[PDB]
């Protein structure tokens, strides 16, 4: 890799790992449409297994980008419309508060205050229905944004219903397979466990626990290589052969709502490039990212803007991931670590790296 990329990456990541006490890390920089990989530390501290380009990391909420794109693919296929009412795909959802709540709302966290987490007690199909029937909106739909798994997770499950495929099967067949993400999983198979890194929380080795709508909202595990390939596919969707997938990727980068200077896509969040570092850095901090904010509808949605900083943070109990790319610059980065460290530190480092690369 160019000494320039090598120097900036190392100059930035070294102190990051040291200050955050990150056990293991893998980084991919996509420069002029080509990936460059870097790895440090351990995937498994106890068994002394190093992080390699084949190490699997939990993506946490970066999984929402795969869900937004899978959903976009369904839209392009003509199986669903974001303007459809949620009840069109779940007629059993009869409670009156659902009138007016569309798939767009679910996809974008703007249904009116659906919670960040689906309650732990919700673990059954009937339990899910019950939960949604009893949920009381705090706001009218399309007025406030509240980052939530119960919102996009539901969008995810409803989105694949017409296809007749299960969510994992649709994700694999319609997204993973066509893009050659052959080491990306919702459920990691036994044959691949040897590559599955342990996450670390307060010193303990941990893996994400099962939960309602986990696949749809935070359950994908991947390698730095496949994540780099994901970034490339998102940087140049026109290069994708499967027509509807190309269209789905574009739809997920369209701007549907604006909050402060951030725009909500399907899973991906975007800001106009150039961006103010402090704006994406401070904005990624959960004190802002997880808060209730008024939103302005973009009527109609702006098609994917090539001059944007497209990104998404992701976390599980033991993992911290980040993905960011600038279509206009053919530039991107993937940062996967097996420790959930502050979002600001992630964005700060990613910005130092990409800014120095143009
Ligand atoms: B929990 O009830 O233990 C629970 C479940 C899911 C989350 C969660 C997962 C992923 C993201 B994303 O931003 O990485 C946010 C929240 C939290 C708690």
Curated annotation (Swiss-Prot):
Q: What is the effect of changing residue 67 to I?
A: Increases activity about 200-fold with respect to cefotaxime. Reduces activity about 8-fold with respect to cephalothin. Reduces thermodynamic stability
* Up-regulation conditions: Can be induced by beta-lactams. Expression is not up-regulated by the non-beta-lactam inhibitor, benzo(b)thiophene-2-boronic acid (BZBTH2B).
Describe regulators of its activity: Inhibited by the beta-lactamase-blocking agents avibactam, enmetazobactam, relebactam, nacubactam, vaborbactam, taniborbactam, zidebactam, and beta-lactam-analog boronic acids, via a covalent binding to Ser-61. Inhibited by non-beta-lactam, benzo(b)thiophene-2-boronic acid (BZBTH2B) and various cyclic boronates. Not inhibited by clavulanic acid. Inhibited by O-aryloxycarbonyl hydroxamates, via cross-linking of the active site Ser-61 to Lys-312. Weakly inhibited by citric acid.
What is the protein's major site of localization?
Answer: periplasm
Q: What does this protein do?
A: Class C beta-lactamase which confers resistance to penicillins and cephalosporins. Has benzylpenicillin- and cephaloridine-hydrolyzing activity. Has weak cefuroxime, cefotaxime, cefoxitin and oxacillin-hydrolyzing activities.
One further remark on this entry is: The class C beta-lactamase family has a specific amino-acid numbering system known as SANC, for structural alignment-based numbering of class C beta-lactamases, or else the simpler name structural position. A multiple sequence alignment was used to derive a consensus sequence and then the consensus was numbered taking into account insertions and deletions. This allows use of identical numbers, e.g. for active site residues, despite differences in protein length.
Name of the protein: Beta-lactamase
Instruction: Give the organism the record lists.
Output: Escherichia coli (strain K12)
- What would be the name of the gene that encodes this protein? ampC
